[PDB]
C-alpha cells in the first residue's frame, strides 16, 4: 500500500511553563497585631525562617524555569520587510501593529482566553502577597517573535551554531527530504500544500476561538489553596474563639497561654501543609517546564525523528506561540491520505542473477513492472543504476522472473 495523496494537518500542544509567586508571612498569618502572640512565636522563628527560605527557593526556581523555557536564544531577530515566501500566509504568527506588545492574533486569543469583602485586601492583611514575575508578557512576546523570525528565516541553524539565511522553498525541500519525500512532489504541488496549510491554520484558529484546561488547572489549584488558607484562619483548633483579643480580654495570660500555643501549633501545621503542597506543585511545574524546553529544543530547533513527540505524523517544522503561564506549539505533521494497492516483489530475477534495490521497491499493477519508494507513489524504469546484484536467483524465497532494462546498453552499442 503506497500512499498517493497527503494532507497537511497542524496540531496544537498545551504545556505549562511557570505559575505565580505567593509569599506568606509567618507573623502576619499566625498572629498579626499582638504582643503576647509574637513573643510566643519568636521561639518558633526557625520554622518561619525555613518556610520563607522554601518560598524564596520556589520563587527563584519559577524564574529559572521561565528563563530556561523562553529565554533560549541570544540574538533578538525581527520580521523581514520582504514578504516573498511562495504563497504562504504568516498574518497569524506575526506581531500586529495595532497591539502595544509583540503578540499575534492566536497569541492574543490565547492570552484573552486565560475592604474585608475584597479578596486581595483581605489576603494582604494576613501577609499573603503576590510577587511580580521577572519576565513580563512583553518580553515573552518579544522572545516568541524572535523565535518565529528565526524559524522562518534560518529554519534551524540559528539554534545551534551560526545563523545562515535560507529561502522557504529550500528549507521546505530539506524537511521533505529528511523524512523521505522527494523535492519534485513539493515543487509540483506547492500551491496545494500552501492552501492546505492555510486551511489547517484557519481550522486551528476557529477551534481556538470556540478550551485551555492545561493553563487553567494551575490557576484553579492556586485559587483553591488561597481559599483554604483564608478559611483556615476561622478555625480555633480547640479554642473558644479565633481572635486572640477575645480570649485575652476575659482570661488572664497564664490561662490563655495554652490556647495561644494551640492556635500557633494549628497555624504552623496548616502553613507546613500548604508549603508542602506548594513544593509538590512547584516540582510538577518544573518537570513540565523541562519537558516543554526539551520539546522546544527538539521539534522547533532542528528535525526530530522520534515518533509521537512532535505531533501525530512526520514532524517537519514547528512555530512556538506565546501564552500566559505556559506555551503553545504549532507542529507541522505530514500525514498521508489516500493510498493504492499494488503487487509488490522483494526481488527481481534477470538473467540468472538477483537485483536488490538500494531503498526502492519493485511494484506492478498487473501489466508492467516499475520501481518506487515506500513513502510516495513514483513509478520509474527498473534500471541497473538503482539496483545491485548480490547472489544468484536460486537463493531467494520470494523471487520472480522479470527483465531489467539497461540505460547504458544503447550507449555502448
Amino acid at each position: 500500500a503506497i500512499p498517493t495523496n497527503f494532507t497537511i494537518s497542524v496540531t496544537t500542544e498545551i504545556l505549562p511553563v511557570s505559575m505565580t509567586k505567593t509569599s506568606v508571612d509567618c507573623t502576619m498569618y499566625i498572629c498579626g497585631d499582638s504582643t503576647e502572640c509574637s513573643n510566643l512565636l519568636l521561639q518558633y522563628g526557625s520554622f518561619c525562617t525555613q518556610l520563607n527560605r522554601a518560598l524564596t527557593g520556589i520563587a527563584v526556581e519559577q524564574d529559572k524555569n521561565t528563563q530556561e523555557v523562553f529565554a533560549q536564544v541570544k540574538q533578538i531577530y525581527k520580521t523581514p520587510p520582504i514578504k516573498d515566501f511562495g504563497g504562504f500566509n504568516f498574518s497569524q504568527i506575526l506581531p500586529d501593529p495595532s497591539k502595544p506588545s509583540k503578540r499575534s492574533f492566536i497569541e492574543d486569543l490565547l492570552f484573552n482566553k486565560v475592604a474585608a469583602r475584597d479578596l486581595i485586601c483581605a489576603q494582604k492583611f494576613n501577609g499573603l502577597t503576590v510577587l511580580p514575575p521577572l519576565l513580563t508578557d512583553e518580553m515573552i512576546a518579544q522572545y516568541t517573535s524572535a523565535l518565529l523570525a528565526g524559524t522562518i528565516t534560518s529554519g534551524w541553524t540559528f539554534g545551534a551554531g551560526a545563523a545562515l539565511q535560507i529561502p522557504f522553498a529550500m528549507q521546505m525541500a530539506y524537511r521533505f527530504n529528511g523524512i523521505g519525500v522527494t523535492q519534485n512532489v513539493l515543487y509540483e504541488n506547492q500551491k496545494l500544500i500552501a492552501n492546505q496549510f492555510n486551511s489547517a491554520i484557519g481550522k486551528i484558529q476557529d477551534s481556538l476561538s470556540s478550551a485551555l484546561g492545561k493553563l487553567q488547572d494551575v490557576v484553579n489549584q492556586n485559587a483553591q489553596a488561597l481559599n483554604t488558607l483564608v478559611k483556615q484562619l476561622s478555625s480555633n483548633f480547640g479554642a473558644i474563639s479565633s481572635v486572640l483579643n477575645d480570649i485575652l480580654s476575659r482570661l488572664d495570660p497564664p490561662e490563655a497561654e495554652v490556647q495561644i500555643d494551640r492556635l500557633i501549633t494549628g497555624r504552623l501545621q496548616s502553613l507546613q501543609t500548604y508549603v508542602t503542597q506548594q513544593l509538590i506543585r512547584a516540582a510538577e511545574i518544573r518537570a513540565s517546564a523541562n519537558l516543554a524546553a526539551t520539546k522546544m529544543s527538539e521539534c522547533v530547533l532542528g528535525q526530530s525523528k522520534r515518533v509521537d513527540f512532535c505531533g501525530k505524523g512526520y514532524h517537519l517544522m514547528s512555530f512556538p506561540q506565546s501564552a500566559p503561564h505556559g506555551v503553545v506549539f504549532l507542529h507541522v505533521t505530514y500525514v498521508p491520505a489516500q493510498e493504492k494497492n499494488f503487487t509488490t516483489a522483494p526481488a527481481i530475477c534477470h538473467d540468472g542473477k538477483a537485483h536488490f534495490p538500494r531503498e526502492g521497491v519493485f511494484v506492478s499493477n498487473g501489466t508492467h513492472w516499475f520501481v518506487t519508494q515506500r513513502n510516495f507513489y513514483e513509478p520509474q524504469i527498473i534500471t541497473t543504476d538503482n539496483t545491485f546484484v548480490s547472489g544468484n536467483c536460486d537463493v531467494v524465497i520470494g523471487i520472480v522472473n522479470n527483465t531489467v532494462y539497461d540505460p547504458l546498453q544503447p550507449e555502448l552499442d
Binding site: 540574538q75 531577530y77 511580580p132 521577572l134 518580553m139 524572535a146 534560518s154 539565511q165 535560507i166 529561502p167
Partner: protein, 72 residues
C-alpha cells in the same frame, strides 16, 4: 504597596514603577545585564563612587535579520 504615605523616611531618589516605590536608587537611561531583580522586568546593580541605579534589562543584540529569496 506604596504608590509614589506608608514609608519610614523620605530618603532620596524616588522611582515609582510596577514593582512599587524604590527609594535610594536613581534611574538611568542606559541598559545593562540583569544583576539584582526587583519586579516586573526591573534589574538594578551597584555600578557607576559606586551607587545604586535602576534600569531595564536587555534581551541581547536586537537587530533585524536579513532574508534572501534567491541566495544561500
Amino acid at each position: 504597596d506604596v504608590n509614589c504615605w506608608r514609608v519610614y523616611s523620605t530618603g532620596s531618589n524616588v522611582f515609582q514603577t510596577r514593582a512599587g516605590c524604590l527609594i535610594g536608587a536613581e534611574h538611568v537611561n542606559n541598559s545593562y545585564e540583569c544583576d539584582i531583580p526587583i519586579g516586573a522586568g526591573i534589574c538594578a546593580s551597584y555600578q557607576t563612587s559606586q551607587s545604586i541605579i535602576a534600569y531595564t534589562m536587555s534581551l541581547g543584540a536586537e537587530n533585524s535579520v536579513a532574508y534572501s529569496n534567491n541566495s544561500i
